[PDB]
Design a binder for this molecule. Structure first.
Ligand SMILES: COc1ccc2c(n1)CCN(C(=O)[C@H]1C[C@@H](CC(=O)O)C1)[C@H]2C(=O)Nc1cc(F)c2c(c1)C=CC2(C)C
Length: 216
């Protein structure tokens, strides 16, 4: 792979992301002004934990399906073996969802997009786990600080998935091949866009995985 070939990979990954992002960035930002009323918030808080779990579990399952679609469209993911493809997605899909979530988070008012409008963390009071929820809001808030480009998310979340340190892989060498090219793609693009400053500020990939191991 030469350097013009790396730009095809970058473009490819950015378009796979564009297709599989579920929520359009334009739409998310326009909806920010559309925020749940105190009456509506109370409505959600009045609900059973069980109903909130079903709604949340539904919406996030859908979210995972979109990540799987993304992965399927990455160059050479489908060329991996079946066991490896599952290991990578089992370990990485939820992590990608958590990173993608920062686009739906408005740091001005500490709110997140949920069922058509923006709500604070008190929306999910019924679930009875503010530990998990504030820490999801905190993580989203810190990624908000970076003002991630769409392409930066695409490239970064591709590297979240394609990680040859996941235990269970049968073809480590094959997955390193992709990881290494994707790393070059990411680093190259950050040079092209004078955004090398963000490498020092991305969260550690240990800490991405530890907030999902606790999740479960
Ligand atoms: C990852 O990027 C994102 C970010 C937000 C959402 C999605 N994906 C998926 C779709 N989605 C929707 O609301 C759907 C649009 C559909 C049709 C409609 O009505 O427009 C309804 C969002 C969502 O699920 N919000 C959500 C869920 C959730 F579980 C939590 C939080 C927030 C914050 C704390 C927790 C409890 C973790």
């Amino acid at each position: 792979a030469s350097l013009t070939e790396i730009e095809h990979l970058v473009q490819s990954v950015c378009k796979s992301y564009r297709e599989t992002c579920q929520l359009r960035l334009e739409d998310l930002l326009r909806q920010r002004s559309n925020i749940f009323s105190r009456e509506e918030v109370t409505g959600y808080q009045r609900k059973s934990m069980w109903e909130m779990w079903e709604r949340c579990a539904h919406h996030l399952t859908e979210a995972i399906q979109y990540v799987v679609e993304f992965a399927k469209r990455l160059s050479g993911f489908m060329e991996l073996c079946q066991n490896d493809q599952i290991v990578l997605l089992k370990a990485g899909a939820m992590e990608v969802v958590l990173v993608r979530m920062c686009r739906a988070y408005n740091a001005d008012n500490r709110t997140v997009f949920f069922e058509g409008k923006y709500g604070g963390m008190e929306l999910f009071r019924a679930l009875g786990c503010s530990e998990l929820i504030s820490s999801i809001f905190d993580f989203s808030h810190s990624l908000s600080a970076l003002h991630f480009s769409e392409d930066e998310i695409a490239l970064y979340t591709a590297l979240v998935l394609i990680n040859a340190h996941r235990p269970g892989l049968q073809e480590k060498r094959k997955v390193e091949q992709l990881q290494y090219n994707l790393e070059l793609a990411f680093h190259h693009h950050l040079c092209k866009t004078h955004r090398q400053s963000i490498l020092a500020k991305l969260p550690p990939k240990g800490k991405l995985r530890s907030l999902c191991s606790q999740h479960v």
